[PDB]
């Protein structure tokens, strides 16, 4: 009638992705954890682009949309930052945003590459993660792009710019022991990387008493957060959501 005792085993940990395994857990908790990786980990991404001068070939909304998609280093600052909608200011103070300034004038004849290197932050902790650098726009001789933009805290549910994951691989039952999927010709299907069968079987023998468990994860970060930070913030956020729901439920019952 109570919680499982989930066990973690990290198989790989690089600076761009983390691969791990969770045993002793139901399918719903693992799926919600993957869902929270994708759509509920807050990061800092550019929003509120104000363009002072844009004589480039790409129109203004194009440049703003490209700026929004640039990932920003938000490893340790995002937790103490506040949502701008909740802050008490003109919506941009240092406690709820990070200012960015771009001012590029192409004077030489050669094609000028406006990259993420040209984004100057007012806070050193928050920079573009590439600082090759992400190309924003190419400028001709005589063209200019000059703007100031901010970066607010948000999560992937609101807009995909705030999604920190570059693809979250999730798997369970690599040998199809539970037969949650029914191969018409199981011999034709390649073995998963976590499969434990020999090269004469195609599926594990069917287990009627089986239950989903030993969920394999591979969380690849776009760069704005370290992958371990993504997972820790994900679990913290889901716990926070459940605690807030418990608070509201208690208030409703009383």
């Amino acid at each position: 009638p109570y919680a499982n005792q989930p066990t973690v085993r990290i198989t790989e940990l690089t600076d761009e992705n983390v691969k791990f395994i969770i045993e002793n857990t139901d399918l719903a908790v693992a799926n919600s954890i993957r869902r929270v990786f994708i759509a509920e980990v807050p990061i800092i991404a550019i929003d509120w682009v104000q363009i002072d001068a844009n004589s480039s070939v790409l129109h203004d909304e194009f440049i703003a949309h490209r700026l929004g998609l640039i990932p920003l280093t938000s490893d340790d600052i995002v937790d103490k930052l506040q949502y701008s909608r909740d802050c008490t200011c003109e919506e941009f103070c240092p406690e709820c945003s990070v200012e960015f300034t771009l001012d590029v004038r192409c004077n030489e004849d050669q094609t000028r590459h406006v990259t993420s290197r040209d984004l100057i932050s007012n806070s050193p902790r928050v920079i573009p993660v590439t600082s090759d650098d992400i190309l924003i726009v190419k400028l001709r001789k005589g063209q200019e792009l000059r703007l100031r933009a901010y970066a607010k805290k948000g999560f992937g549910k609101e807009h995909a710019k705030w999604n920190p994951t570059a693809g979250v691989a999730f798997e369970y039952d690599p040998d199809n022991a539970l037969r949650h999927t029914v191969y018409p010709k199981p011999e034709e299907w390649p073995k998963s990387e976590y499969s434990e069968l020999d090269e004469d079987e195609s599926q594990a023998p069917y287990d009627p008493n089986g239950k989903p468990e030993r969920f394999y994860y591979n969380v690849e970060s776009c760069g704005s957060l370290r992958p371990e930070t993504i997972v820790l913030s994900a679990l913290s956020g889901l716990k926070k959501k459940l605690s807030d729901l418990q608070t509201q439920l208690s208030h409703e019952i009383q």
């Binding site: 399918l27 719903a28 693992a30 799926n31 919600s32 993957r34 869902r35 994708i38 759509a39 070939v57 129109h59 203004d60 909304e61 194009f62 949309h65 998609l69 992937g156 549910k157 807009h159 995909a160 710019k161 999604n163 693809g167 979250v168 691989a169 999730f170 798997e171 369970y172 039952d173 949650h180 999927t181 029914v182 191969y183 034709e188 299907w189 390649p190 998963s192 989903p212 591979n218 690849e220």
Partner: protein, 526 residues
């Protein structure tokens, strides 16, 4: 034929036809005749040799071109009249090789059969695996597809223009696309499409789309509309002048704002405008004065992109005002493959909600499985498989129609080498519950086209407003507004319903009510 093939006294386009049975030799030289080049065949051998191919390989820095091929008497133009007197080989590799003889006297040989297709039909990958009505439908839809219609679109001011943010050349392409410049000006995006039944919004030839992909600019587009206007001087009857109408000096106006304009009566570029804002303040003199300023269309909205002013043919000042409007894909926007798989966006789901493979790939689009069987658009499935092979291999796949070097077996064997199921299926996980979907989903890259028919350009409603001047009924003008005709079909349909009150309400109360006074004795309206 010797003289024509040598470019002697007879020019190439002259066509000679011998009716042997009727003993006639008709030579035609006039214009209007259609012809095409065919390789000449002599004694079951092409006159084309490896030397000509070597010379054509160095087409640059040799000055050997097609005209020298015609001058060498290897290829000649044949018209449809002369085709009746021509025995033509489909391909030289087999049709003229020695075997159990079908015909030992071939006069010509096709260059490639795929050239029978036109322009819009030649961008179809694997059209010979489709049903021909869907080839026709795609030939229509490629005309309707979004894309970068021209490289100098920035200076041009066309009345309507649509430009896709991130167009891509197809991963699965035809050879003939190299000569249409489709590789330079593509119209569409390669989309990871999964052909699967799901929550139910893809049903009945509709499409589920990945909301996060759209947030990343997937099929995001821009729509340019240009409004032109000229001030004129017609004797002294009146005179139009570009200037912002002030609220005191002109007795005729609308409730829309007039402060967006500058002192010259024109709106500056880089200013948002709603569907009623004024962009060209033009005042016509009253024999005070009146306004005839132009506003945006009622449903439209956007930012003034560009503003050009110049003198027309007579020398009057006139301006053209390009208005940018960024269109994001939404529910109702049309999409189509290169196989006539027309469909609207049923609903948009975030990435977590979409189903996903074992390696975290969510499809950009989901289409209904039932769009295939009555269609028999097997070329769509072969395109998906070939595109998966192309993306894994890192090489643009080939989908020339009548090519025997490529078939589904070879594509499947190539795909199996990359650790995928040979038929393109994959084990997809339900994005909501995380459970494995029982059946394995057919998923892969496929080239999709956004058609110009967005929902916002075709949504309109009316309560009441600009009636006619004669019929005193609603009419169309300034927008799509003006009601919908309750035609004879709807009239008889409601008669079948027996809904006399609703029929009367539609036809009398809520279209054009009126009342007249008529004498009781006579019958004429008094």
């Amino acid at each position: 034929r010797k003289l024509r093939r040598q470019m002697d006294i007879i020019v190439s386009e002259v066509s000679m036809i011998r009716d042997i049975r009727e003993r006639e030799i008709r030579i035609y030289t006039d214009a209007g005749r259609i012809c095409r080049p065919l390789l000449i065949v002599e004694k079951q051998k092409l006159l084309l040799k490896k030397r000509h191919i070597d010379q054509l390989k160095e087409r640059e820095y040799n000055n050997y071109s097609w005209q020298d091929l015609v001058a060498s008497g290897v290829v000649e133009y044949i018209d449809t009249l002369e085709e009746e007197t021509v025995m033509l080989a489909m391909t030289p590799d087999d049709l003229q090789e020695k075997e159990v003889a079908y015909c030992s006297t071939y006069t010509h040989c096709e260059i490639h059969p795929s050239m029978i297709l036109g322009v819009c039909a030649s961008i179809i990958p694997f059209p010979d695996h489709n049903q021909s009505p869907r080839n026709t439908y795609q030939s229509a839809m490629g005309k309707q597809a979004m894309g970068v219609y021209i490289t100098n679109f920035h200076v041009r001011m066309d009345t309507l223009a649509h430009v896709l943010y991130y167009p891509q050349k197809p991963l699965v392409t035809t050879r003939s696309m190299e000569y249409l410049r489709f590789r330079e000006l593509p119209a569409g995006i390669n989309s990871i499409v999964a052909i699967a039944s799901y929550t139910g919004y893809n049903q009945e030839d509709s499409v589920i789309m990945n909301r996060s992909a759209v947030d990343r600019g997937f099929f995001r587009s821009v729509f340019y509309r240009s409004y032109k206007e000229q001030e004129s001087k017609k004797g002294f009857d009146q005179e139009e002048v570009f200037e912002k109408p002030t609220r005191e000096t002109c007795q005729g106006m609308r409730h829309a704002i007039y402060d967006k304009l500058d002192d010259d009566g024109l709106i500056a570029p880089g200013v948002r405008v709603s569907g009623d804002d004024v962009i060209i303040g033009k005042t016509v003199t009253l024999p005070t004065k009146r306004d005839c300023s132009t506003f945006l269309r009622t449903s439209e909205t956007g930012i003034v992109d560009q503003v050009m002013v110049t003198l027309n043919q007579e020398g009057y000042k006139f301006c053209k005002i390009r208005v940018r409007s960024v269109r994001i894909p939404q529910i109702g926007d049309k999409f189509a493959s290169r196989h006539g798989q027309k469909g609207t966006c049923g609903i948009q789901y975030r990435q977590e909600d979409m189903p996903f493979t074992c390696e975290g790939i969510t499809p950009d689009i989901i289409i209904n499985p039932h769009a295939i069987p009555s269609r028999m658009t097997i070329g769509h499935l072969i395109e998906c498989l070939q595109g998966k092979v192309s993306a894994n291999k890192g090489e643009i796949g080939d989908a020339t129609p009548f090519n025997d070097a490529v078939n589904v077996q070879k594509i499947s064997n190539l795909l199996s080498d990359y650790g995928y199921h040979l038929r393109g299926n994959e084990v997809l996980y339900n994005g909501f519950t995380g459970r494995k979907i029982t059946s394995q989903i057919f998923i892969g890259p496929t080239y999709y086209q956004r058609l110009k028919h967005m929902v916002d350009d075709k949504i309109h409603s009316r309560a009441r407003g600009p009636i006619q001047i004669l019929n005193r009924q609603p009419m169309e003008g300034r927008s799509r507004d003006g009601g919908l005709r309750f035609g004879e079909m709807e009239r008889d349909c409601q008669i079948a319903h027996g809904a006399a009150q609703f029929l009367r309400e539609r036809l009398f109360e809520a279209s054009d009510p009126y009342q007249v006074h008529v004498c009781n004795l006579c019958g004429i309206m008094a």
